[PDB]
Amino acid sequence: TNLCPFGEVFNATRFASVYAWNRKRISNCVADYSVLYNSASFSTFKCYGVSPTKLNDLCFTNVYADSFVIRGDEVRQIAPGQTGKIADYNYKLPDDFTGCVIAWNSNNLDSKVGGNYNYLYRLFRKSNLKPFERDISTEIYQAGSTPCNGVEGFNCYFPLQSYGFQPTNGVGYQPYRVVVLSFELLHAPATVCG
Amino acid sequence: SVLTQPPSVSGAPGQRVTISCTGSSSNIGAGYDVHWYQQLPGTAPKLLIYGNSNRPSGVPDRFSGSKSGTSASLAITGLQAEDETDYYCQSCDSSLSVVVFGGGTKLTVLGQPKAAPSVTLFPPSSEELQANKATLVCLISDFYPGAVTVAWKADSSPVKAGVETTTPSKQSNNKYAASSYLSLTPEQWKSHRSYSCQVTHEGSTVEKTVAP
Amino acid sequence: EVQLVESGGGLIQPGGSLRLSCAASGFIVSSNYMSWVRQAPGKGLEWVSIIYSGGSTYYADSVKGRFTISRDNSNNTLYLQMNSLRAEDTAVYYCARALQVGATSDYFDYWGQGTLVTVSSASTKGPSVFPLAPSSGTAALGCLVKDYFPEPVTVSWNSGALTSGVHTFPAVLQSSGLYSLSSVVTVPSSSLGTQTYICNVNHKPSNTKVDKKVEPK
Ligand SMILES: *[C@@H]1O[C@H](CO)[C@@H](O)[C@H](O)[C@H]1NC(C)=O
């Protein structure tokens, strides 16, 4: 009966690109939600299927932690029922979501003076992601009626594109590390309690 | 108009004209890039610059772009008269997640020699007189610059009711044409001894006269 | 290889409805950010609607609830169903492919020609075409296209094969609310008896097709 490892997913040094978003499963542990309410640093903390404060005295079968980096102006898309480029082609929550979305500004870490180009978003996809899908393909997107045959050009576009995170950007285009906790409830016996 | 551009700018051929686009912290200051479109009147817009400064294939290196803080700028070097068109900038705004356009800019290309106007005054057709109507047409061709002052007269009395006059546009020869119309009744037309179209171009008036 | 061709525009009573169509070739609409941008006559550009490659749709606040952007794979077509049309909806409606490929914001890199939507309670009226008999070593003749509504009017001479010295003017909007334009031709005085001049006038809103030979007098 040892701790839940939220310190290694929240306090982690390197963060995924949103299109290739990371996922840490959380099983068989006792969860100190204290580190969430006592943080000051979070810019977002909306919960969905649960009451945000009662997290302590609650029990779950499995908890999942998803981490990635987006713009400030995009955090409003990491929430059930939202649409748009991130929600449609990078990371969608079910409508029946039960969990908490957490974010915080990371301009000081994830920006660089010439722009940090490590962090990527998918700009093109033929279909909206289904919820919790992850698409890491790098095929050339075919906007035209003729095949691209492995050559980018007119109507033939690489599907990923980079944020140009410079520290001088407006808040809208500053980076924000995001953590999405999924509280899974299965008929099987619980393993994540307080 | 969210983004704000000068209503008009001017230049002579071979020069370098710049058109500014000022936004705010909800668009250009939010880090949404600026794009620039060219539209010739009567036609469709054409992407000229995207992503602040990139040129689509087919846009000569004469056109360039830039963005600083909340303003952005279109530079046209080696100005040619084919660039005498409307220009629009465009960004996206985050306050209202909607793409926003500037108000537009009309670029006038200057430095051509003065050409005086040719004035032809058409009396009402007989077919129009049968239709109990009467229009005097005053065509004004081949002038530069495109700026005229039309004044009508009935006999020796100026007339201002019933005038409609067009805004000059380039002909097929790059000189400008304009037109003014005088609306009359058939009874008015036959009851005066003459009418006159009197176009004043650059201090100099050309007059033309017809009669029943 | 690539084309966008819009149609559907006309004259509609306020409150009425209309469906604009944008036929594409080269572009697969279903795979693209497609968009409707409009422009009131003499005025600036205003975005209207967009539809995402995966199907998401957004709308200018002016049209939210009234306008619907959809697409068809069979016809490879983009549509805009415009209901409860108000006067201020009067404009030329453009169809555009949208991209974000070198930028942090979206742009429209290829545009169609535009289809004109006029919402008004004025009924259509055909033009009356009158000849302007030649006058002054050159000469000018032409055609007066008067009292029509609404825009536009197209004018050609000699079934389009007389192009020299031909100038068609911007219409004027008269006190009456009706438009009137003239198309002139500058010709050699020497040619005056030899050549034959006939203006072809076409007012598609009223389905008026008129010719008019312009003889001297
Ligand atoms: C992250 O580190 C801080 C101090 O560096 C620590 O107090 C905090 O508990 C850590 N966060 C988590 C979720 O363990």
Residue numbers in the entry:
A (entry chain E): 333 to 526
B (entry chain L): 2 to 213
C (entry chain H): 1 to 136, 142 to 222
Authors' account:
To reveal the structural basis for potent neutralization of the public antibodies, we determined crystal structures of P22A-1D1 (2.40 Å), P5A-3C8 (2.36 Å), and P5A-1D2 (2.60 Å) complexed with SARS-CoV-2 RBD. All except P5A-2G9, P5A-1D2, and P2B-1A10, displayed single digit nanomolar binding affinity. Heavy chain sequence alignments showed that the HCDR1 and HCDR2 are highly conserved, whereas the HCDR3 are rather different. Of note, P5A-1D2 has a longer HCDR3 (15 residues) than the rest three antibodies (11 residues). Compared to the other three, P5A-1D2 has a relatively longer HCDR3 with 15 residues, providing more residues to interact with RBD. For instance, the T104 at the tip of the P5A-1D2 HCDR3 has interactions with RBD Y505, which is absent in other three HCDR3-RBD interfaces. However, recognition by the long HCDR3 of P5A-1D2 resulted in significant change in the side chain conformation of Y505, precluding Y505 serving as an anchor for P5A-1D2 light chain binding.
